[PDB]
Ligand binder design. Structure first.
Ligand SMILES: *[C@@H]1O[C@H](CO)[C@@H](O)[C@H](O)[C@H]1NC(C)=O
Lengths: 49, 49
């Protein structure tokens, strides 16, 4: 997993991580990763938390 | 030093201060001030910390 290339795919501003830090994702080793994708409204982004 | 005129020079939103507060900068008296200027990408601003 190379998390330093994600910035080259989408025009977002910054991550928002809860249990870890965005800069420390290149050192830890996990068991499985899951990715969920969808489209919502502008003011409903704060509800994903 | 008058830090209330800085808002009239650049179209930024707000300060981001770490050791002090932006509203209390008119009272303290320092020894020297340094200013560094450059241009970076949009998503690399969060790395200046
Ligand atoms: C720096 O500040 C103004 C904005 O108030 C800018 O338009 C201009 O390039 C500079 N000021 C002058 C007098 O040139």
């Amino acid at each position: 997993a190379d998390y330093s290339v994600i910035y080259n795919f989408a025009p977002f501003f910054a991550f928002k991580c809860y249990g870890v830090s965005p800069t420390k994702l290149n050192d830890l080793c996990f068991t499985n990763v899951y990715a969920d994708s969808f489209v919502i409204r502008g003011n409903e982004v704060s509800q994903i938390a």
